[PDB]
Design a protein around this motif. Structure first.
Motif: not given
Ligand code: CL
Ligand code: 7M6
Ligand code: 7M6
Ligand code: KAI
Ligand code: KAI
Lengths: 253, 249
Positions: A96-98, A222-224, B98-102, B224-226, B228-230
């Protein structure tokens, strides 16, 4: 007290200079240490910095096994990875990346004085050798790519039992300075290098867009929190100040 | 599997009404960068979706009492599964959703007309003849509001003076203000790029003064967040996000 895995890489994490033997966190300085300090101040955690035993970032082998800092997180031998660890598809599926604390892209490091101006200039010739750090995210970009020119470059890079690749960035830098060789390198590292050595320059722009992120194990609580602290640091201008501090170097035109 | 509710907002070229000669219904009403993104996400992740404009027509900010509005509120209250829009990833928002990565990178920059000697935010900050502002309650305005950087505090003082008359209600208004009067709009760089391709009297002044991204919004704790990030990282590394941007810009 969190265990932070990291790796020596200028100017992110470096051995501090001193006349006495150093111990613990006092061994280190650099951008990532400053980052870790700001993060601990915001979140209120203590931390033990530990170099990753195998000295690797994190890649897969044929059998699908991971190594490096990525493996350290997966096995819960560390709580955070703080390093120039590129956020990539393959890595994000296993940790899990920040959100990113720094943006960058793949670009070209090369000596000054030449008509070379792009990746296409390299792909359409063979006299100039070019490569990347073996098994880094940059190499993986070329190997997994289905874009014409980048496909062509990978073919050349991996040919001859990968003689065009290098094991690490310093080897790449020496190779550029000595021979007719261009290194595919992350832009932030090119910026760092070209402000210390005025014989080197970046060729062209960024060929892709990505970030470095703090690594945590899947499901880490911790990620979030670290994401939120990073956003705070960016909005306060602190990430920018930190980078100015460590990238200044000697100054080059 | 349940059809996901996707909240969004009209904004060129992310989400626009499709031009046809007859009435439109459902998702067919819409086209744009974000519709293409949504469609790529649905193919990778295998979900059906219903696009729904955010009823109050806002992105998401807090008022005096700290209450949220807009797409952010929609997510907080579980009235939508996803927000797909140019919704800037910010500290205040990330704490409540929660936001996905950009899926896109950007920074605040300056929209102004060509031919002037203005070259930076500093140039604007140290004078008062040229008026400058931002979209009221947008992440750009909030950036200036919260900044402790000297130049940016000075700019916030200007923008908020005279009961915020230097601010505009929306980007289209800002754009017209820049074209017609002596006014510079603090605007997200991606939007500047789009505007200056279409208005050849306009340009960006200076560089980006910060660094951030748009991300898909989901309610805190969404599964769905993670995923969608992937999916976003995959689209990025395959170069499809780059293609999608070129298409719409
Ligand atoms: Cl993220
Ligand atoms: O808001 S963020 O997720 N974290 C803060 N940073 C700034 C350091 F990179 C960036 C930069 C670029 C993009 Cl696309 C997104 C972000
Ligand atoms: O890996 S990510 O979080 N999502 C994929 N992209 C591509 C969207 F532009 C980027 C771009 C820049 C940064 Cl700093 C980080 C990222
Ligand atoms: C310095 C090294 C080997 C690291 C840094 N980020 C990339 C990674 O995290 O894979 C690698 C560089 C590259 O592949 O150009
Ligand atoms: C177009 C608008 C009002 C939005 C889009 N992204 C920013 C946000 O998500 O707050 C706003 C722009 C800005 O503040 O420059």
């Amino acid at each position: 007290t969190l265990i932070v895995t990291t790796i020596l890489e200028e100017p992110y994490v470096m051995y501090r200079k001193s006349d006495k033997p150093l111990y613990g966190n006092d061994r280190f300085e650099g951008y990532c240490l400053d980052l870790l300090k700001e993060l601990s101040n915001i979140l209120g955690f203590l931390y033990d910095v530990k170099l990753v035993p195998d000295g690797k970032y994190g890649a897969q082998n044929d059998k699908g096994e991971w190594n490096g800092m990525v493996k350290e997180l997966i096995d819960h031998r560390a709580d955070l990875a703080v390093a120039p660890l590129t956020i990539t598809y393959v890595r994000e599926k296993v940790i899990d990346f920040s959100k990113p604390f720094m943006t960058l892209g793949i670009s070209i490091l090369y000596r000054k004085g030449t008509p070379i101006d792009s990746a296409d200039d390299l792909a359409k010739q063979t006299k100039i050798e070019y490569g990347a750090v073996r098994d880094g995210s940059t190499m993986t970009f070329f190997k997994k790519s289905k874009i014409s020119t980048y496909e062509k470059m990978w073919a050349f890079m991996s040919s001859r039992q990968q003689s065009a690749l290098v094991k690490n960035s310093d080897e790449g830098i020496q190779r550029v300075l000595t021979t007719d060789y261009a290194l595919l390198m992350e832009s932030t590292s090119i910026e760092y290098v070209t402000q210390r050595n005025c014989n080197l320059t970046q060729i062209g722009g960024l060929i892709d867009s990505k970030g470095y992120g703090v690594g945590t194990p899947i499901g880490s609580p911790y990620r979030d929190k670290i994401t939120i602290a990073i956003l705070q640091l960016q909005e306060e201008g602190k990430l920018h100040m930190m980078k100015e501090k460590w990238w200044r170097g000697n100054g080059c035109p």
